[PDB]
Amino acid sequence: EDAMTVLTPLTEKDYEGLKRVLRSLQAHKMAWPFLEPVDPNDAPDYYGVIKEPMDLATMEERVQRRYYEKLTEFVADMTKIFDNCRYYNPSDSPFYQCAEVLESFFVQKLKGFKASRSH
Ligand SMILES: CCNC(=O)N1CCN(C(C)=O)CC1
């Protein structure tokens, strides 16, 4: 991550772009496992092995409250969604697959966002 990712405070116009990124991932056909927090009745050990859970609804709450001060911090929470999934699930599970797909989409949208920031 370069000069501007780490450093640059997020402005109000930057926040309009982060909302748009987040809604694109929420609309993706492969987002379904990540839309809301993991239900412990589906995976009763999940919260004993994943130390820092994340999901897209918590990220939306944080975006609305202006939680994030730098782009790096938003990227960090998104990345955790995907890393948590690939650590918990085996490499041949549909959940692991979805993480693969959705992370590649995220990177495409994040590059779009960075390009838009300064011009
Ligand atoms: C839908 C229920 N199926 C499950 O076994 N899981 C596994 C853990 N998980 C994620 C997102 O990592 C979702 C819940």
CA distance 112 to 76: 18
Q: How far is the CA of 79 from the centre of ligand 1 (A)?
A: 17
Domain of residue 100, residue span: 1-119
Method of determination is: X-ray
Tokens (6 digits) for 50: 């994943």
3-state secondary structure of 70: strand
**CATH number (domain holding residue 22):** 1.20.920.10
Degrees (nearest 5) of the Cα angle 58, 75, 13? 85
CA distance 57 to 71: 18
Resolution given for this structure, in angstroms: 1.3
Closest CA to 82 of 110, 63, 61: 110
The number of folded domains in the chain is 1
Q: How far is the CA of 62 from the centre of ligand 1 (A)?
A: 23
Q: Which residues line ligand 1 (CB under 6 A)?
A: 33, 38, 42-43, 46, 85, 88-89, 95
Closest CA to 62 of 105, 46, 54, 51: 54
Atom of ligand 1 nearest to the CA of 33: 11
Q: How far is the CA of 44 from the centre of ligand 1 (A)?
A: 10
Degrees (nearest 5) of the Cα angle 78, 81, 86? 130
